[PDB]
C-alpha cells in the first residue's frame, strides 16, 4: 500500500510546487559535517 502523497496527481502537484518554490536548504538540512570513519564503523584530495 503506497501512501496517497507518493503517487498520482498529489505527487505531480507537490513536485510542481517544490520545483517553483525552492526552500532554504541550509536551515532544512544543516551543514554537511566531515565524515568520521572511526565513529561510523568502530593526499591532495582533502585540500579544498
Amino acid at each position: 500500500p503506497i501512501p496517497t502523497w507518493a503517487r498520482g496527481t498529489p505527487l505531480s502537484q507537490a513536485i510542481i510546487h517544490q520545483y517553483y518554490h525552492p526552500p532554504n536548504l541550509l536551515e532544512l538540512f544543516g551543514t554537511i559535517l566531515p565524515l568520521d570513519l572511526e565513529d561510523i564503523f568502530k593526499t591532495s584530495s582533502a585540500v579544498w
Binding site: 503506497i2 501512501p3 502523497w5 507518493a6 503517487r7 505527487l11 507537490a14 513536485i15 510542481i16 517544490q18 520545483y19 517553483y20 518554490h21 525552492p22 526552500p23 536548504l25 532544512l28 538540512f29 544543516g30 554537511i32 566531515p34 565524515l35 570513519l37 561510523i40 564503523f41 591532495s44 584530495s45 582533502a46 585540500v47 579544498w48
Partner: protein, 269 residues
C-alpha cells in the same frame, strides 16, 4: 539533527537495481527527497569504507543545477543514510530506451548541461571519470542530473593514473596507462553525444579486446543520416591527443549546441 524518524517513506525506486533507494519526504516540511540506505556490514564486507567517504566529500562540495544534490547524510548503529535530490523524470537510460535515440534538440541540451556542470567540477578540481547515459537522471523540466560519483576524484594537481569508468567510454590515454587530467571528461562527452544521436556507442564490439583497439585507433564511423553539426562536435571531442580535444568553453559556444539547445535553469529565490 536529522535521523530516520524525520522522514516518511513513499515507495521504493528502481526495484532493487540501485540498492535501497526510496522516495521520501521530511515529516514537518514535506520537502521530497530520495533516501538511500546502505548497510554498514555490507560496506565493510566489500571494503568500500574509503569509497563511501570519497563519494560523500565530493558530492557535499558540488552545488549545481545539473549535478544531483546531496543534501546531507546521517547514520545509526546499523545503516548509512544519504539524503539525495529527487529526480522526478527518472533515468535518461529509460528515456533513451523508448526511442533508442534522441533528437538534436534533446541531445544538444544535454551536452550544454554537462559542459556547464563539468566546467563547475573542473574549476573545483573534480574530475568525474565516468560520464555516460546511465549515470544521468532527469529533473522536473527534463534537465540532466549527474547522479553517480563512484569514479570521481578531487585532485588539485589534475594528475591521475587509475583505470576508471566503463568499457565503451574509456579514453585512449587511460587504456595506454598514461598520466591523465580533466580532458578524460571531454572524451566521454563526445562518446555520449554520439550514443544519444545514433542509439549505440561508437567503439562497440563483441569483445573488450576489440573495443580497446577501436578506441586506440579512434575508429569512429558516422551514419550518413548524422547531422553535420553533431558530426563536427563529436570529431573535435574524440581526439587521440587529449589537448587537441574541444575544451568545455568551446563546447558551449559550438554552433550546433547553440542552435539546438533549449536548456532551462531551475528556479531559485
Amino acid at each position: 539533527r536529522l535521523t530516520v524518524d524525520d522522514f516518511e517513506i513513499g515507495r521504493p525506486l528502481g526495484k532493487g537495481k540501485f540498492g535501497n533507494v526510496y522516495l521520501a519526504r521530511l515529516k514537518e516540511s514535506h520537502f521530497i527527497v530520495a533516501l538511500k540506505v546502505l548497510f554498514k556490514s555490507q560496506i565493510e564486507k566489500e571494503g568500500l569504507e574509503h569509497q563511501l567517504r570519497r563519494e560523500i566529500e565530493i558530492q557535499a562540495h558540488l552545488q549545481h543545477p545539473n549535478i544531483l544534490r546531496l543534501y546531507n547524510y546521517f547514520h545509526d548503529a546499523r545503516r548509512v543514510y544519504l539524503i539525495l535530490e529527487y529526480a522526478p523524470r527518472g533515468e535518461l537510460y529509460k528515456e533513451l530506451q523508448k526511442s533508442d535515440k534522441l533528437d538534436e534538440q534533446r541531445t544538444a541540451t544535454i551536452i550544454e548541461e554537462l559542459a556547464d556542470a563539468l566546467t563547475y567540477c573542473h574549476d573545483k578540481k573534480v574530475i568525474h571519470r565516468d560520464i555516460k547515459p546511465e549515470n544521468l537522471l532527469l529533473g522536473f523540466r527534463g534537465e540532466v542530473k549527474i547522479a553517480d560519483f563512484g569514479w570521481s576524484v578531487h585532485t588539485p594537481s589534475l594528475r591521475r593514473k587509475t583505470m576508471c569508468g566503463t568499457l565503451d567510454y574509456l579514453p585512449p590515454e587511460m587504456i595506454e596507462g598514461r598520466t591523465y587530467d580533466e580532458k578524460v571528461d571531454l572524451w566521454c562527452i563526445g562518446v555520449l553525444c554520439y550514443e544519444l544521436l545514433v542509439g549505440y556507442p561508437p567503439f562497440e564490439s563483441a569483445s573488450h579486446s576489440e573495443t580497446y583497439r577501436r578506441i586506440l585507433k579512434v575508429d569512429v564511423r558516422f551514419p550518413l543520416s548524422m547531422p553535420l553539426g553533431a558530426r563536427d562536435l563529436i570529431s573535435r571531442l574524440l581526439r587521440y591527443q587529449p589537448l587537441e580535444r574541444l575544451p568545455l568553453a568551446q563546447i558551449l559556444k559550438h554552433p550546433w549546441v547553440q542552435a539546438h539547445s533549449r536548456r532551462v535553469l531551475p528556479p531559485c529565490a
